[PDB]
Amino acid sequence: AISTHMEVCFMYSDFHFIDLEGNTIVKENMLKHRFEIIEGQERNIAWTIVNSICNMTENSKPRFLPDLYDYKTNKFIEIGVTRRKVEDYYYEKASKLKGENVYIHIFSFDGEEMATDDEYILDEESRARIKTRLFVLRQELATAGLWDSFRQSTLEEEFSYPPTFQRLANQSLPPSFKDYHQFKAY
Amino acid sequence: GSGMERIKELMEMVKNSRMREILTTTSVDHMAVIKKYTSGRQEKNPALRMKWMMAMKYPISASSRIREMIPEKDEDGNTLWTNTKDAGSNRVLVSPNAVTWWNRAGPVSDVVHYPRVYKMYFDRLERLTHGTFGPVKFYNQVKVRKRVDINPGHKDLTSREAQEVIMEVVFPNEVGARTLSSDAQLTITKEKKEELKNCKISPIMVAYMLERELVRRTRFLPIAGATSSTYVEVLHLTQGTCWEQQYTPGGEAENDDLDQTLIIASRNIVRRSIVAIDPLASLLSMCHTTSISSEPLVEILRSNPTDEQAVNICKAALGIRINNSFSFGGYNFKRVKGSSQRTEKAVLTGNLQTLTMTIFEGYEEFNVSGKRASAVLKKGAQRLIQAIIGGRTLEDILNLMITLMVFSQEEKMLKAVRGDLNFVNRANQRLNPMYQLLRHFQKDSSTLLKNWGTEEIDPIMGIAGIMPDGTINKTQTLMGVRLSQYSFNERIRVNIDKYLRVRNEKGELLISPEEVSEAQGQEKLPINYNSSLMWEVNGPESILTNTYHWIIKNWELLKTQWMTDPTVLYNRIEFEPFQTLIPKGNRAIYSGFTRTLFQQMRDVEGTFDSIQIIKLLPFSAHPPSLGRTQFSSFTLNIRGAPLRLLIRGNSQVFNYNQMENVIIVLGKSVGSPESSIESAVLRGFLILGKANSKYGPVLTIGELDKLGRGEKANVLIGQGDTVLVMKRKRDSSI
Amino acid sequence: IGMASMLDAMLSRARIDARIDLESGRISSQDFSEITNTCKAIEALKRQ
Amino acid sequence: AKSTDEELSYTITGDNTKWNENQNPRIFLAMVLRITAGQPEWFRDLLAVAPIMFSNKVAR
Amino acid sequence: RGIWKTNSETGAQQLNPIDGPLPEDNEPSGYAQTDCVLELIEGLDRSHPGLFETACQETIDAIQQTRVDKLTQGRQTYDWTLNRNQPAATALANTIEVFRKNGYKLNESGRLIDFLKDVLLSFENDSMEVTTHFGKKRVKLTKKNYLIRALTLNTMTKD
RNA sequence: ACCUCUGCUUCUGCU
RNA sequence: AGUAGUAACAAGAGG
Ligand SMILES: CN1CN([C@@H]2O[C@H](COP(=O)(O)OP(=O)(O)OP(=O)(O)O)[C@@H](O)[C@H]2O)c2nc(N)[nH]c(=O)c21
Ligand SMILES: Nc1ccn([C@@H]2O[C@H](COP(=O)(O)OP(=O)(O)OP(=O)(O)O)[C@@H](O)[C@H]2O)c(=O)n1
Ligand SMILES: [Mg+2]
């Protein structure tokens, strides 16, 4: 799940730059990246990047860690991928992220999507690539017998004595007691 | 090249396999340990070690870069640096001549930010430069240990609020997830952020100083006078074992400190006045002579909006309009109708804790206003009958609700305290019951809210309801808690009689002096009563020591007067302050006991005892009243704890030390005056000497009445002693 | 705080610092590229 | 304050002989188990570790 | 006058005077009596209802929040990996490093309690490997050796 | 001989 | 010898 989510995110912004002018470009090989990839940064590092962006733009900081930020739209991106449906899932995500400016963009393995207000900030070409890859994954998930498995998916502190320490404990008691557990009960 | 030099350095390090291993295998978390990895030990005798090293040529460790920044040898041929690396680093060993060289001839930076970064320090000098000195006076005063504030100019933030703020100010991009709720936080941030832009002093020092400045710090110190932080800061200068150096620091007071001192002054004046023959005249005198830091108390009382019972008695006397209210939890409380009366009683909290606590019993009605919220409250004995509440936000209506639930004194809030809440500090000092509860339920009301309950509301819609959630709710609410939306602030003309009872124009009783809190607080700012009715040295301990010191030093005159003209002695005005230390209910009997005993000493010649006289004399100073009670001690209230002064011999409070030949009162010498028969211990009896089983079993004191003229006994007189007493054949009238 | 390596944190920080410096004008576009370049070379060198 | 006027009062200025040598890890174990009564067993057992180790200590 | 036993793990001779015979003179005694201690502690519980519970609660929170680096705050510390004293932080690092080389690394969480777990778990090891400097030699402690070092307090005189 | 290094570092604890 | 005082120093280590 996480592996795929990550790949999607990397795809969304790879070979997507901005000129010294300041216009969307796409290139294989002066430029500067178009998005900031936030997903897959360790939590603490990620918040630093968010903060640096928000302090630059004087925009409000989101309650949750987004997956991308776009230096052209000046928008934080959230991304999801679902072996389920594109709309029962979206509506859960928009709810969780209620009341903060975050462009959502679902994709399913079928190879169909659903942006917010069906306004796409990425070109069809680059969006096709992702829809392609999502299906091909469903295809190799099903051949191996995994795709059925995949699509379906506080504890109290523990502290106890391993054998040696247990034996030490048993020998650390007033003389009438045979073992640590008997002494603790008394 | 912002970022240029550091990434290039990083490149070079990663080219080394070792360094790369470290940087790839050490978590940020684990860096906290390896950061301290060292063979170097914390010097254990730094004084010796420095005396040793300062004999050496190159005792100082400096950055490698010193080698580029200063000459290797100075004009006199002193070597300033060497290429020897200090153990465990890339620092190099250098001479102290390098420091001097740098200070005479090195690079000159500009220091514009220094005052602002080190403001906490510079302010100290500012206060001193603009300080005023008065005279030094010499006297003994008890310096009682208490916790006091030590850093003027803090912003009253917790360490986590300070951290949050300092993170925003100094290292904004490293803040992490959450950001600042408080507006105090936000305006400090902007101010500081604006003061410290382009600042090139190390961020370590800036954070350090901000933390020192912004967080309230305290310490336990022996302190006789003003407890304000600006006075604490110069305690070494203003207070000695036998002296006070009168002093006023430069700068403004805190409004908080002034308000606090105004209350203490007003209470002191009221308590002193109540024991005068003409309270109102005495109160006015003191009001008109008193100052707080050289400001006349009269002017403060005219300009100061504090509503408090003693303050208001003073305002009334002076013809100043009052808002017949008090403060509690930041909200102002006007009593509309009804009344109640102060009674202390034991109280088990849900914390599981016994506690004496003054509890108001009776029917009362309160209009309540704060800056964001307001309410109407009806109250019984620990009864929240009803609270109608309004304000700007839900938040602000909530915060007042909490306050009112706590103010009720209800069992349900009493027995909703959870976790760590105690009524005595670490030093065993009693704390304010009600302020403790308030602070607790403002930290966390969840138990309180759940423990309270609910109520089904009617369709007279407009009388809305609030749920144990904190939620807005139409049909249900809490119990007694409702929501709704001219002259609450409006100050009225009152009148005041000779005994300080305050009434409106219609002539209803608004305030009586018996409603004034008995708490003896310590003033944040200096009070000078400048009054013949007050000891020059302030405070309860000082009433005790001053009075006894005064008796002793004037003993020759006072003795003759004890012999020739007692009643004039007893009525002297110098004994009135001391009267305020005696429980009201005991003054007359204590006086009657004392006068009787003193007459016995006169009648029974040869039994004069100057110490016994000095000791009991101040207790003579109230219209007497005879009784059957024998006293083994008199109670004195010092700082809300009773001390007992033993009638017979020495006590912790009052003792004559043979060895020094001094009288010691609360641990302080107050100087010295310089047969077996004791005439002035028991009413009606004489002590002859040591016990004698001849005259039968040892009786308590409270079993002596059942004797008769001339008849004797053995008595457990106190402090373990047994003595032979005789009932007197004639008794003394007084 | 973090489970990230010292190196990874420094790389992530250099990159995003260089980007803000660029927008805000504290740094040239040339400098900026060299920073992201140095970063990439560090990324690589970290694989032996 | 809590005393009656008829009571004598004495103070011992007090010190103990070889305090540390006569303290006992087994007793500390008892104290820790009793103080932590009713608490989660992981925490009781965690806190009991120090006394147990002291019962089994050696001195270089 | 107490009871001697041989420790199963270290072979140490261990004297136990608890619930031993009552003192018979005024000489210093270690014959503390469990039931008497318990009576006293119960007395303290009864005098201060809720005190034990609160102090426990705070201690639990502390156990959850404390970072491993808290142990850097000590002074000279016996360092079993060297059989010599070292600054506390250096001693901590050495333990962590040798632990991880021998397969104990719950402490990577950064939580003190996880380091405590590693400690107890380290006693199950057949032979803890450390390195001495002759250049560099790997030395294997016996299970017994290791446990003895773990249970060691180094000693010196008070100046 | 003479050379080199070292001057708290095999030894300074605990709330 | 001297310092010291329940055990040390009166140089140590290495070449
Ligand atoms: C619950 N309360 C509290 N209270 C008033 O609350 C005011 C301040 O609260 P407090 O806790 O008594 O503080 P106070 O004694 O002034 O503080 P200090 O320790 O400085 O003396 C007092 O003036 C007191 O009269 C009340 N007054 C009336 N009439 N009825 C009540 O039910 C209550
Ligand atoms: N420098 C010190 C001094 C004392 N203590 C602790 O304080 C206790 C009491 O110290 P002291 O009365 O000086 O010694 P005792 O061990 O009681 O021995 P004695 O009084 O018989 O000399 C010690 O046992 C020890 O736990 C300590 O840890 N460090
Ligand atoms: Mg002792």
Side-chain angles (χ1 to χ4, degrees), chain A residues 1-153 155-186, chain B residues 1-485 487-627 629-673 675-732, chain C, chain D, chain E:
Chain A
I2 289 173
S3 283
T4 314
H5 187 333
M6 206 83 70
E7 183 172 47
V8 169
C9 279
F10 267 94
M11 290 194 66
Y12 207 109
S13 87
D14 282 358
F15 307 161
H16 291 280
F17 292 81
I18 292 179
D19 34 45
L20 294 181
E21 162 59 16
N23 275 15
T24 317
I25 293 176
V26 183
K27 286 202 175 191
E28 313 290 1
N29 209 297
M30 164 284 287
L31 295 166
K32 53 129 162 274
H33 276 249
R34 195 217 169 186
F35 304 76
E36 192 59 41
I37 309 169
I38 297 172
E39 176 68 72
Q41 297 294 30
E42 198 275 351
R43 269 170 267 193
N44 298 292
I45 289 160
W47 277 111
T48 295
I49 295 157
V50 184
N51 278 303
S52 309
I53 290 163
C54 300
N55 287 166
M56 206 210 336
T57 64
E58 288 159 47
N59 275 67
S60 69
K61 305 167 181 182
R63 291 205 178 221
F64 303 99
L65 277 177
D67 292 334
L68 304 169
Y69 174 79
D70 173 15
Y71 289 90
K72 180 74 178 167
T73 328
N74 292 108
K75 287 189 175 169
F76 291 107
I77 322 303
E78 173 71 47
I79 281 178
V81 184
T82 187
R83 301 82 64 164
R84 322 182 61 195
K85 295 197 172 180
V86 176
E87 296 157 10
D88 61 2
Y89 183 75
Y90 177 104
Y91 268 174
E92 276 199 350
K93 194 164 281 276
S95 301
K96 173 191 167 181
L97 305 187
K98 183 156 183 171
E100 52 192 346
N101 179 354
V102 173
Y103 171 73
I104 315 172
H105 197 161
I106 307 304
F107 297 70
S108 53
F109 290 81
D110 319 13
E112 62 188 293
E113 70 197 8
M114 176 197 180
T116 282
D117 310 310
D118 287 13
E119 304 170 71
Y120 300 106
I121 49 175
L122 192 61
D123 60 15
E124 299 161 53
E125 205 166 21
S126 314
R127 281 181 289 133
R129 308 187 189 196
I130 296 161
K131 297 158 82 174
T132 296
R133 185 72 179 99
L134 286 173
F135 174 48
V136 171
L137 274 160
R138 183 180 169 291
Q139 263 280 121
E140 294 172 48
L141 281 163
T143 52
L146 327 172
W147 167 249
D148 264 69
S149 173
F150 190 42
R151 172 168 55 184
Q152 291 165 2
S153 65
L155 276 163
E156 215 217 23
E157 193 60 71
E158 63 84 14
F159 195 90
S160 59
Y161 293 171
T164 304
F165 203 77
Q166 184 62 57
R167 292 192 298 287
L168 292 177
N170 293 339
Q171 285 170 101
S172 297
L173 321 172
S176 63
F177 295 88
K178 99 172 48 157
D179 61 57
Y180 171 74
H181 284 98
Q182 171 199 46
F183 184 53
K184 193 156 73 166
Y186 161 88
Chain B
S2 173
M4 280 281 276
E5 184 149 296
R6 74 188 177 165
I7 199 67
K8 283 172 191 162
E9 185 175 20
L10 184 54
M11 172 55 76
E12 260 22 69
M13 295 166 72
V14 184
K15 279 172 165 168
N16 177 279
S17 181
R18 212 334 201 179
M19 287 188 168
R20 178 173 60 242
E21 258 285 311
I22 286 160
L23 295 160
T24 60
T25 68
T26 311
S27 64
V28 170
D29 250 298
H30 184 44
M31 185 189 57
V33 171
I34 61 99
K35 175 164 167 65
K36 279 153 190 155
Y37 189 95
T38 182
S39 59
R41 295 192 290 240
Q42 182 89 246
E43 179 57 69
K44 59 189 205 315
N45 191 338
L48 185 162
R49 202 74 53 234
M50 190 64 79
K51 275 166 170 58
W52 190 238
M53 292 187 291
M54 278 312 299
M56 301 173 186
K57 271 157 186 176
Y58 313 112
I60 298 165
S61 186
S63 290
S64 190
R65 55 210 253 286
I66 187 162
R67 287 191 295 176
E68 282 64 73
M69 300 167 98
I70 75 164
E72 178 168 339
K73 308 207 167 190
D74 68 13
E75 302 89 294
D76 298 291
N78 298 315
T79 303
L80 304 191
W81 55 252
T82 74
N83 299 291
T84 312
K85 302 291 170 164
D86 192 47
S89 84
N90 283 309
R91 295 196 143 232
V92 300
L93 301 190
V94 309
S95 171
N97 287 303
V99 168
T100 311
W101 189 86
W102 173 286
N103 287 344
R104 55 186 172 68
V108 174
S109 64
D110 92 301
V111 289
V112 293
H113 293 94
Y114 267 73
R116 283 180 297 183
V117 171
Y118 293 107
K119 176 169 188 290
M120 185 186 74
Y121 294 163
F122 275 101
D123 285 353
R124 295 171 194 182
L125 177 52
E126 279 305 294
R127 287 186 288 273
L128 173 62
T129 296
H130 297 103
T132 311
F133 288 111
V136 165
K137 299 168 158 172
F138 285 84
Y139 55 82
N140 252 325
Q141 197 179 20
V142 178
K143 304 152 182 70
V144 168
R145 285 164 171 97
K146 57 172 282 157
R147 188 170 221 80
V148 294
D149 294 344
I150 62 165
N151 65 319
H154 65 77
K155 268 76 169 53
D156 205 4
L157 300 181
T158 40
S159 291
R160 274 56 54 177
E161 291 167 289
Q163 279 184 94
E164 280 188 4
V165 163
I166 296 167
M167 283 297 301
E168 291 282 346
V169 173
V170 190
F171 311 111
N173 296 317
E174 309 193 45
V175 151
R178 283 182 174 172
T179 51
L180 310 184
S181 32
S182 154
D183 191 299
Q185 284 191 300
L186 290 159
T187 46
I188 292 160
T189 298
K190 294 175 205 148
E191 179 203 301
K192 290 299 181 178
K193 198 273 158 190
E194 190 45 51
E195 284 187 61
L196 306 171
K197 58 154 292 196
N198 301 113
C199 175
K200 292 185 200 171
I201 298 157
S202 161
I204 295 172
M205 293 313 300
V206 171
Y208 168 86
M209 290 305 304
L210 285 177
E211 198 157 68
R212 302 295 287 170
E213 168 178 342
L214 296 177
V215 183
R216 197 177 75 116
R217 285 175 289 112
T218 67
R219 169 168 289 162
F220 262 81
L221 293 170
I223 186 156
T227 64
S228 180
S229 65
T230 53
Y231 287 89
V232 165
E233 161 178 290
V234 296
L235 196 60
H236 64 284
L237 174 57
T238 63
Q239 172 185 289
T241 70
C242 62
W243 54 270
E244 170 194 37
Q245 166 71 81
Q246 295 181 227
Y247 175 76
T248 308
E252 290 288 80
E254 271 294 305
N255 283 337
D256 281 346
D257 287 356
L258 181 63
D259 291 0
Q260 182 272 11
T261 302
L262 169 60
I263 291 175
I264 284 143
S266 299
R267 291 177 181 188
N268 287 344
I269 284 162
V270 171
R271 293 197 287 248
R272 167 65 182 86
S273 301
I274 288 174
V275 138
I277 193 179
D278 185 338
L280 179 55
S282 288
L283 176 137
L284 284 169
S285 177
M286 281 187 280
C287 285
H288 276 278
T289 59
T290 298
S291 69
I292 298 169
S293 332
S294 321
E295 247 256 299
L297 189 70
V298 169
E299 285 297 301
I300 296 163
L301 281 165
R302 291 207 299 81
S303 61
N304 186 297
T306 299
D307 317 310
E308 183 280 339
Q309 292 90 336
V311 168
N312 283 339
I313 289 172
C314 292
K315 285 174 166 178
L318 287 175
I320 300 156
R321 296 208 283 183
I322 67 173
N323 199 67
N324 177 39
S325 50
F326 52 74
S327 195
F328 182 128
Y331 289 104
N332 291 355
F333 282 70
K334 199 161 198 167
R335 187 170 64 178
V336 190
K337 264 139 197 160
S339 64
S340 67
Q341 200 180 74
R342 304 202 173 198
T343 308
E344 305 183 16
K345 264 143 193 176
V347 151
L348 303 172
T349 69
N351 217 170
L352 302 159
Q353 288 200 113
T354 296
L355 178 63
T356 287
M357 179 163 58
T358 312
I359 288 180
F360 302 88
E361 313 144 303
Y363 184 77
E364 292 160 283
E365 306 180 58
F366 284 95
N367 293 140
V368 181
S369 81
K371 311 203 178 186
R372 305 194 186 182
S374 81
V376 185
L377 165 67
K378 293 173 181 177
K379 209 210 81 80
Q382 301 180 236
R383 261 259 59 172
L384 184 96
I385 297 162
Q386 216 214 4
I388 314 97
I389 306 167
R392 306 158 163 178
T393 309
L394 181 62
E395 276 189 290
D396 314 348
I397 285 169
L398 296 173
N399 299 358
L400 173 56
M401 200 202 330
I402 299 310
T403 307
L404 294 170
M405 278 186 294
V406 168
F407 180 99
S408 56
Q409 298 192 298
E410 284 257 293
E411 289 304 319
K412 291 188 296 177
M413 66 82 49
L414 287 186
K415 304 206 170 159
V417 179
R418 297 278 159 286
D420 171 64
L421 189 64
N422 43 67
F423 296 90
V424 309
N425 74 2
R426 268 169 164 189
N428 288 336
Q429 288 160 339
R430 278 194 177 186
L431 300 179
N432 186 283
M434 294 281 92
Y435 170 101
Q436 293 276 254
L437 292 161
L438 187 83
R439 289 288 157 239
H440 172 48
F441 291 112
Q442 285 166 352
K443 297 319 90 204
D444 182 47
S445 55
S446 49
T447 314
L448 173 63
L449 300 178
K450 295 162 195 187
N451 199 46
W452 199 267
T454 64
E455 204 154 61
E456 183 59 59
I457 236 304
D458 226 24
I460 304 182
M461 292 159 294
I463 308 169
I466 309 180
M467 280 294 293
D469 315 48
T471 284
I472 331 93
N473 189 250
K474 289 192 176 181
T475 87
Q476 274 214 301
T477 182
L478 286 153
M479 294 187 51
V481 176
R482 314 298 178 247
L483 207 168
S484 325
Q485 265 68 46
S487 54
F488 177 99
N489 313 57
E490 198 140 4
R491 307 178 107 62
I492 62 173
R493 180 168 319 306
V494 284
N495 74 100
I496 189 180
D497 72 3
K498 178 156 161 175
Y499 301 94
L500 310 184
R501 306 162 216 126
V502 179
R503 297 163 172 116
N504 50 16
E505 288 197 353
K506 291 171 184 172
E508 308 159 58
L509 173 73
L510 309 181
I511 322 170
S512 146
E514 71 219 58
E515 291 165 57
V516 169
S517 163
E518 308 173 290
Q520 309 169 352
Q522 213 163 311
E523 48 264 36
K524 286 264 174 180
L525 300 180
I527 305 167
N528 184 193
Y529 301 104
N530 187 43
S531 180
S532 66
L533 304 180
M534 295 290 274
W535 295 100
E536 180 171 298
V537 188
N538 297 342
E541 297 84 11
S542 296
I543 295 172
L544 281 190
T545 55
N546 294 150
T547 297
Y548 285 116
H549 178 276
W550 174 88
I551 296 175
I552 290 162
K553 86 171 165 179
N554 294 115
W555 172 242
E556 211 51 59
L557 176 89
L558 296 172
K559 172 174 64 167
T560 62
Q561 191 161 15
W562 184 91
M563 288 179 306
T564 77
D565 196 3
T567 21
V568 176
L569 180 52
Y570 304 157
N571 296 312
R572 277 208 185 222
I573 195 170
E574 290 87 353
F575 295 141
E576 290 189 350
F578 189 112
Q579 281 286 310
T580 70
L581 299 177
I582 300 174
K584 286 142 192 144
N586 291 342
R587 299 186 173 134
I589 53 190
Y590 284 9
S591 181
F593 193 74
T594 297
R595 297 190 190 203
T596 300
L597 296 182
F598 279 169
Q599 193 51 48
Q600 298 184 185
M601 176 172 303
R602 284 185 198 96
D603 299 346
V604 182
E605 287 163 345
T607 72
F608 193 73
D609 172 357
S610 74
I611 307 306
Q612 193 62 354
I613 293 166
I614 293 164
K615 189 208 310 165
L616 300 186
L617 187 53
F619 298 89
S620 65
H622 188 281
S625 143
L626 268 167
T629 29
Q630 301 277 4
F631 294 93
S632 55
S633 54
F634 291 154
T635 295
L636 297 171
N637 305 127
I638 279 61
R639 281 194 209 280
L643 303 182
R644 296 215 304 278
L645 185 146
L646 289 164
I647 301 305
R648 189 165 179 257
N650 290 325
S651 54
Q652 298 304 297
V653 141
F654 182 108
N655 68 81
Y656 169 71
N657 188 270
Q658 236 87 40
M659 186 257 179
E660 300 182 63
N661 178 45
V662 300
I663 293 161
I664 307 169
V665 167
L666 291 176
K668 295 293 184 183
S669 171
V670 289
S672 35
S675 83
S676 305
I677 290 77
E678 305 166 46
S679 52
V681 173
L682 289 167
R683 162 162 37 226
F685 300 83
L686 222 76
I687 299 166
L688 312 186
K690 31 282 140 213
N692 201 323
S693 62
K694 284 182 183 194
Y695 307 88
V698 178
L699 300 175
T700 67
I701 292 171
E703 287 169 350
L704 278 176
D705 30 50
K706 303 141 193 153
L707 317 185
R709 309 292 191 165
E711 185 196 345
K712 306 195 168 175
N714 303 296
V715 187
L716 178 66
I717 191 57
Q719 299 301 296
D721 287 308
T722 320
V723 294
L724 180 65
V725 298
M726 192 217 304
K727 176 156 280 155
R728 286 176 76 235
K729 292 205 163 183
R730 59 159 305 290
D731 56 292
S732 307
Chain C
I1 307 171
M3 293 314 146
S5 67
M6 290 179 65
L7 185 48
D8 291 355
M10 286 166 87
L11 295 172
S12 293
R13 176 62 154 189
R15 284 175 160 116
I16 286 70
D17 276 3
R19 178 51 174 251
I20 275 79
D21 295 338
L22 182 72
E23 310 313 70
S24 311
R26 302 183 212 109
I27 193 176
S28 76
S29 279
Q30 280 183 357
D31 289 296
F32 162 94
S33 302
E34 198 177 8
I35 285 177
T36 48
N37 283 9
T38 307
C39 284
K40 283 193 169 195
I42 290 155
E43 289 285 8
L45 190 43
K46 160 174 90 102
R47 281 153 199 187
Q48 285 120 66
Chain D
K2 286 164 59 180
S3 64
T4 69
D5 288 345
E6 24 291 291
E7 269 166 343
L8 288 160
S9 186
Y10 290 71
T11 302
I12 296 180
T13 291
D15 189 275
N16 290 285
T17 307
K18 300 296 179 287
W19 177 253
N20 74 84
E21 300 171 1
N22 291 300
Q23 292 298 312
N24 190 280
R26 305 173 195 269
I27 291 299
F28 289 158
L29 177 61
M31 295 178 59
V32 159
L33 292 181
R34 178 56 180 82
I35 288 164
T36 66
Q39 295 293 317
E41 294 297 344
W42 69 270
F43 158 78
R44 315 219 304 155
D45 293 343
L46 161 19
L47 286 204
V49 167
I52 289 157
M53 291 182 166
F54 266 79
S55 190
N56 291 291
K57 72 195 169 289
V58 302
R60 276 264 145 203
Chain E
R1 303 178 75 222
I3 279 161
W4 287 99
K5 293 288 164 172
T6 304
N7 193 273
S8 69
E9 315 300 299
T10 66
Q13 292 298 310
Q14 301 182 322
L15 183 53
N16 184 355
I18 300 312
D19 309 318
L22 299 187
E24 282 179 63
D25 64 24
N26 287 317
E27 290 311 305
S29 144
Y31 309 110
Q33 304 291 305
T34 308
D35 66 345
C36 294
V37 168
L38 288 179
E39 178 173 359
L40 291 173
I41 298 301
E42 180 182 309
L44 208 63
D45 189 35
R46 174 180 295 100
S47 298
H48 298 99
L51 177 44
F52 291 174
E53 192 184 10
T54 293
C56 286
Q57 281 165 9
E58 294 165 347
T59 306
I60 290 165
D61 298 342
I63 289 158
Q64 291 162 335
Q65 305 304 108
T66 305
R67 287 272 131 199
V68 178
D69 74 306
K70 187 60 173 160
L71 289 179
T72 65
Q73 294 179 12
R75 298 206 154 71
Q76 291 291 110
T77 292
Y78 175 68
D79 188 340
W80 65 273
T81 74
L82 296 174
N83 202 22
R84 259 82 174 296
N85 288 349
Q86 294 285 282
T90 314
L92 177 57
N94 288 344
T95 287
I96 286 167
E97 182 201 337
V98 174
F99 274 6
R100 67 140 202 99
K101 283 176 186 181
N102 287 263
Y104 308 92
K105 53 165 46 59
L106 293 175
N107 71 76
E108 278 167 355
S109 74
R111 305 204 304 152
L112 216 202
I113 190 181
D114 286 336
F115 172 83
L116 293 188
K117 288 176 192 192
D118 283 336
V119 169
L120 296 196
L121 289 158
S122 68
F123 301 144
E124 299 310 310
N125 202 264
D126 283 302
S127 54
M128 196 75 54
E129 191 165 82
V130 313
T131 52
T132 328
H133 296 254
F134 61 77
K136 178 170 174 170
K137 172 140 207 163
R138 286 167 184 174
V139 157
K140 286 172 194 178
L141 302 184
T142 66
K143 180 174 209 283
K144 170 178 162 170
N145 289 157
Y146 168 58
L147 178 56
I148 285 167
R149 293 200 185 187
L151 292 167
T152 286
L153 293 92
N154 205 1
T155 68
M156 54 287 307
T157 138
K158 175 64 181 189
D159 290 318

